[PDB]
Amino acid sequence: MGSPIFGYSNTQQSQRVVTADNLMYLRSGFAIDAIGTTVNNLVGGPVQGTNGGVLRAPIALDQLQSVEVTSGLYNWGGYHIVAIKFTMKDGSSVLLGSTHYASNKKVETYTVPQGKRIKQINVWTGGWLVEGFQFVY
Numbered sequence: 001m002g003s004p005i006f007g008y009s010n011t012q013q014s015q016r017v018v019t020a021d022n023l024m025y026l027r028s029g030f031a032i033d034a035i036g037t038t039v040n041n042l043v044g045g046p047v048q049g050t051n052g053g054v055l056r057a058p059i060a061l062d063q064l065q066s067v068e069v070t071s072g073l074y075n076w077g078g079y080h081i082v083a084i085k086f087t088m089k090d091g092s093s094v095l096l097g098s099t100h101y102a103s104n105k106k107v108e109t110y111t112v113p114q115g116k117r118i119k120q121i122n123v124w125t126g127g128w129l130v131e132g133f134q135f136v137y
């Protein structure tokens with residue numbers, strides 16, 4: 001019915017439906033700042049001062065094979081998701097965020113089952129970074 005909750009889920013839960021375009025959008029820097037399914041509906045911290053990260057090229061969810069999610073104690077505070085490595089069905093991968101600015105890290109690896117379309121992304125944020133996310137089928 002879905003993936004595990006990657007990262008942490010203590011903060012507020014938002015739900016972002018995947019459109020027919022099958023896209024996942026992220027803002028990231030040294031951590032994961034926000035996640036959405038359109039350029040307009042990202043869930044996470046605002047672009048405020050020097051915070052908020054950079055909007056990255058979207059992930060084609062219909063092309064996604066697996067994720068490797070690194071979470072930990074971010075050096076500027078709190079437990080959040082700091083990096084996501086997306087491996088695609090063509091064999092390529094992209095790493096957003098960073099593993100180098102957090103302690104007490106964990107890595108969670110998950111493969112999207114063949115024939116399962118990701119229909120929704122649940123995202124947990126307290127208003128600064130992304131603490132967790134989950135795929136729903």
Ligand SMILES: OC[C@H]1O[C@H](OC[C@H]2O[C@@H](O)[C@@H](O)[C@@H](O[C@H]3O[C@H](CO)[C@@H](O)[C@H](O)[C@@H]3O)[C@@H]2O)[C@@H](O)[C@@H](O)[C@@H]1O
Binds near residue numbers: 028030032049050053
């Ligand atoms: O993706 C997370 C973050 O990554 C990049 O900023 C990294 C950190 O850089 C530090 O120099 C500092 O600016 C951090 O921001 C926190 O700490 C400062 C200093 O106390 C504070 O003013 C801020 O409000 C934050 O609490 C950064 O996290 C950038 O890509 C950034 O845009 C992105 O959010």
